[model samples]
Target: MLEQPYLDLAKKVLDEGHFKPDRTHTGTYSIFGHQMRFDLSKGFPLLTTKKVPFGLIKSELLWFLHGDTNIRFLLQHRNHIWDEWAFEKWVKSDEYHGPDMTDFGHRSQKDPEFAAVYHEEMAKFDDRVLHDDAFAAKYGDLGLVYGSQWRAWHTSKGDTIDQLGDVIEQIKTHPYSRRLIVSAWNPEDVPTMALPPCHTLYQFYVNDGKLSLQLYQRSADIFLGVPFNIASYALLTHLVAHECGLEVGEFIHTFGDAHLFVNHLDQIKEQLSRTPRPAPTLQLNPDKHDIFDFDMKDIKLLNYDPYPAIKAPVAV
Candidate 1:
């Protein structure tokens, strides 16, 4: 029985606190976001309102799994969702030059000619990473969190990439392993990222052959991005569980600095006014458990109902 307690908490918290224009603390901020906890014991974590298009979620997850650093694929599928960011920042920024995402953010945005050059250079690098597993295994950083931790995470005095994988395995083999944790909060790497990770760390647990995932997000963008984040990670949990030879489980989302951006207040009010509908059904290609093997084409969803789309700008 997965409920929207996280969403309830988020609404309550937002109503209690005032939105601060500053990005200093967690109490309130320019971004309004919501989180939901999905109990894998009950079913898959699909949004009940605003029928989340499965193709979008599937494509986004696949993009992450591939460790894609470019917005090209994402833009190709849902031009409306990512077009602004890609065009405004990646395509137009003086810092953007690479053909892909990794190299673009690595450059200095202060320069004028850097955008085009970075794009070209990044394209070459992306080709190598996509075609050559060896290249990506050695050097590919997906702006935010996952790739850096999965490939090149350095702890106080040791490598932490394998630790994350181990945590996933532990969740499968030993559901109660107190060590079932995956983190992406490397202070050393945070500054290097274009934007800090939002969905930073998650823990796993299981009961009665069902798996559950809990995420601790440092920030959230409720109107536009939160739903996507919810679906993405829930799918990730399911994929990881399937890989570990276990059933998909619940997803618990805990937040520290959750708030709604001032601009999205009207949309939030609209959403609050609408009655929630029954959650939609998501069906993945069970035969294809390998995260990388899945593409936008393999996933499907059924019966999602919600209010019409509302747009919001990204804070970054």
Candidate 2:
């Protein structure tokens, strides 16, 4: 079972992590340091205990590869995972003439009436982003997200460097190079950004004609976010290997602050009670050598059989 490591980690945190409060005011069972390794040669690391949404993961990774910071591309792909971060910017600006959306994240969870209003406003915002080009251009862009940091890192010389593109090139030219790394954390941008990068930096290593990746994530929401993160980095490793004409190796994920929210305890227990099925195989288009040009149709999951999805509230 390729997916057992993830389940084991979740159980470990729930059983032994310290109880502590978090920034969201929803408490967590926290652990300081943890690590997991997925051997991609076995299968894709998507969870078999729950049905993970592969489409959303694929589109988001592609958006990062393209170095796009706007939500329009994600919305066009029907992915609304990052909408809240972008919408927060629109509602906080002076141009916003709608109802008071102050502390919408906490309010929406506490008050039903406010949640309804917030949902209506969010629908309108999404519609405008999809239909109106000018509005999308102005308000849809998240200034310094992962896409921006990975693809177009601003230098002190007033020019941009493509860290991701450069790393891919390095993997191809110098397979044994020790410098194949891309970072998403910028000290200057972190203080002002709405949400700082959690999956901060990653490095690639080549050994025996196979490519492996190691991701250093600063914070991880185990119940809600870790599954997607695993599949995402695994897919990334596969893509880079494909580009370099090499076979896939292992994906090593290291974490700084890994925790499970208190509200998700029951849901996690339910997931752990279920047995893991066989892992699925990821099929990327053979003709698409360039990762930047990949689309939804180009990537797919084969024979993914998993238990029903468990519902859990995100801790803002």
Candidate 3:
């Protein structure tokens, strides 16, 4: 019986925030988007109305954890959610030494010109040894706050270090470390990132043998991004909690800047008007204790009845 706090929060925030039109982005005025809250006790808080493919969610989480920047892997997996932007950039770049996106056609890499440019872009972003701008902008900083701490966490001074492993240790040994936090936003590096971190940071809390998580997302793209963000972190909660040998607790989601794309208003209304069905129960791999070991196939869900899928153009 997952609650509709997300829906309720979305409605409230949209009504409260002032709609001041943003001149920088077209039709993107300030307001009409809302933040959401979820209590994990109610089950995974993914939007049950929309049939979000679990494979896509798993793949995206893998990408983030594997610290990938390029869309090549995503494309190979038939996850084209990130394709539009990569294609857009390839066409807009001054170094367009390949076939145009129009000529390339859908999923057709047979074209030599297209192949050359695609590989070039892929190499630039995927091959960390090369360290190109696109990759550097996306995953270069080691997820800055999340991946860095998750995999390689060490202080230069060697005084205090916080990482997933260390967090696990604390949960096991002490289980009362009040300072359990993983960050993704670094103010100093924000200027260098092509796109700043949206799901910026999260904190973990343990109480009465249950592990809870709270996420602070700085910016939310209501249509294309927010749903994934919700699913990703909720999954992350399951992973970390399971790894630490704790029961799943509440997930508190807070947002600093939340806005819906102007084009998505009608779709949002349509969704809001519909009654939210019961949330699906997520089952994870019990044998897999390692956070990084969990794959897309390790998770399963049942009984999700959501509204029809809604589409909206990204504001890029």
Candidate 4:
């Protein structure tokens, strides 16, 4: 039943949500102000109605924990979830000396010949980031992203604060403090950011040896991103609780503009037709007390059986 909330969200959007124009050029059907809750004590909330790839989630979260904004580490790990975001910056900047990639995002989807060229261009970009240090240093870095916002918050005085590390320290020392919050939305950075934080802010609470987290996301692609967001943050809460020597609790996902893209109607409908399997259990290396030290090998998902992946085009 954990994934029922996910299915419900999709259904709600399709039934009562408004079809609005905000122009990713695919438009959207959205409902404002919705929330979903999953008890982590029950199980990890990786969706069972449809296959959710947990590898990309693990690598992305690990990269964020390390405070790395560069796609180089991700490329080295063969995680390309973030490649397009950084590649967008590369193509827009002067350093890109490749074929014209104008409107590459939408074009690659529509034009097969353009898709071939874009794929080749992206492969070259990925190759350079992996092997060429200088190019990677310049082009691979996705400045002011989740990794940077979570791990390093820059202040007006120009010093960076390790927000996640500090939050964990606070949780360990003061378990019941009401002030446990991290904001990814820096007003000054939003206008220039590639994408301002969709999962904008989060607050943590600890009670009776259980740690709970609630995230307030301003924007959500309910079909494509919400499943990943749920699992990602639920896994995050587990990792943090493990480090703090507390039991896993709940992941409360709160949203502002939760929507399904116009193109994702069929995909979302297909998932809703399926039933959710039992949620998976997460295994972390018991010896690894520090969350930062835990790598992909240290984390594992057990007993996860889900419906086949329902693919949909991403609204780039």
Candidate 5:
């Protein structure tokens, strides 16, 4: 029952959605607007049809909470979700002496030899970031990532604003304030930046001893990305509520261009055929009031019995 909204979304898009060419040329079945809400009071919103890797979500959210922009922290945690973005930055820089990685994503898929070389170069890049402090400090930092935007939003006056921190305080002191919002979009950075945050902005609301969060995501990759987005925001809401000593409420996910890539149709259909199971329970360390201080060991999922994971090619 908890993950039905997600299943319904996938099926609805596949059946009645309009197909169109995407920026990646993979093509997608697109829907203009969609919304899914998960009640945290019921259970954590990790998908049951196909097992969503919770560890990757955990490490990623922690990295974001730390206000960290470096891939080093992520690699240290064995998370490679954001590796391509950092690797692309490294290869394109003057310091890189590796083989040409221009259009590596499609090239890797098409040419096996190029894929090996690409993987080799990527591994080398990852190793250097992990071991070489100077290199990691200089190249690993992705400028204006979610962390930079959430915690250190640079203003015209050359100062940083902690939008997330300010919002949390407001949730504590002014529960009913209408201004509890954080945005990751910067008009100045959009022109030059590639792959800006799809989960663009979020707002927090408070009610009777409960905390709720709503995320306005500009794009939703239904098959691969939406599952993670749901769980990540659910965890975020839990952590935020924990910090504020409020009861768990709901996570409202609103999407703009929600689409399923043509390539992923079979995988999504496979997921749809699987029966939904019980949702997992999230366990946050009660002693830890501050959400930022939480490490991987401090948070966990209980009784997450989902079917085997589904695999699909990510359109890069």
Candidate 6:
């Protein structure tokens, strides 16, 4: 039932969505607005139709919770998902003396020879981030990402507000309050930032001793990004609930522009043909009550017998 919502949404987009071009120049079967809800009481909402990398999801969310904008934290976790954004910044800087990485995103996807070169450069970038602290401090920081906005929102007075920490406190002290919200979209930062936040903002709701989260994502790559986003927010909801001593309620995901890329059409069709198995159980450390203090070892996934992973090229 949990995975069915995602399947139905994918089917609807394929069957009826308009053919449209996007920022990446990779086209999509696009729809305007869509919503899916996951009841946490059933099980952890990790999709069973495909093998979602729960480890990467866990580490990335933990990085956000720690309010780290630097790629060092992520690199240490062996999560290379956010490496490209930082790598792009590094390769374009005055300090960079590497081979031309211009249009690397599209070029790497299209050309095999260039893709190998891109991989080499990216491996170098990842190594420096892990070993060279000063290099990492200079180029590895993605200045206005979700981590910065959530944990340290800069104000007009030059003071940083911890929106996430404040919201967690609010959920504990004022469970019935409707103002428990954390926003990633900042008007000031959107213009200069390489990629503006896709999962823009989210709000928390408390009812009957259960904590629920609703995410408003501005743009979603239905075949690729949506699965990760769902698990990320669901884990976020679970962590917040665990901290506040409340039962997990639901993860309500609302999308602004939901689309399956033209390149991923066949992959989605392959995924649809498979049957989903039982949902997995997530185990958070009982000793780690504070969300900010979690590590990779503290979070675990149990009995996740999902279908095999499907490979598809990212649309930049």
Tell me how candidate 5 scores on lDDT: 0.91
Cα-based TM-score, every candidate:
0.70, 0.98, 0.76, 0.98, 0.98, 0.98
Q: Please give the lDDT score at residue 297 for candidate 2.
A: 91
Q: Write one digit per residue (lDDT tens) for candidate 4, span 162-193.
A: 99899999999999999999889999988987
Q: Please give the distance, in angstroms, between residue 283's alpha carbon in candidate 4 and its true position after superposition.
A: 0.8
Q: Spell out the clash pairs found in candidate 5.
A: none
Best by lDDT: 2
TM-score of 3: 0.76
Q: Relative to the true structure, how large is the alpha-carbon lDDT of every model?
A: 0.61, 0.91, 0.65, 0.89, 0.91, 0.91
Assess candidate 3 and give its lDDT: 0.65
lDDT of 1 by residue, 1-316 (tens): 2336635654675567555765522223433343556766455555554445667777766766665555555645652343333343434446445444443343435455876665555455455544655544444323444654653466677644565556666765677776677776778777765557787888777767777788888876666666777777887887777777777767777776666666666666666655566666666677876666677756666566555666554443
Off by over 4 Å in 2: none
Task: Flag regions of model 6 displaced more than 4 Å.
Answer: none
* Better candidate by TM-score, 2 or 4: 2
Model 6 lDDT tens row, 184-234: 999988898878899899999999999999999999999999999999999
True-structure lDDT of candidate 4:
0.89
- How much does each candidate deviate from the true structure in C-alpha RMSD? 6.7, 0.9, 6.2, 1.0, 0.9, 1.0
Cα lDDT tens digits for candidate 5, 1-316: 9999889899889998999898888999999888888888999999888888999999999999999999999999999998898988888889888688999988999998889999999889999999999999988899879888999999999999999999999998999999899999899998889877898999999999999999999999999899899999999999899999999889999999999999998899888888888888899887777788889999989999989988899886
| Model 5: lowest-lDDT 10 consecutive positions | 285-294
Clash pairs for candidate 2: none
In model 2, state the lDDT of residue 2: 94
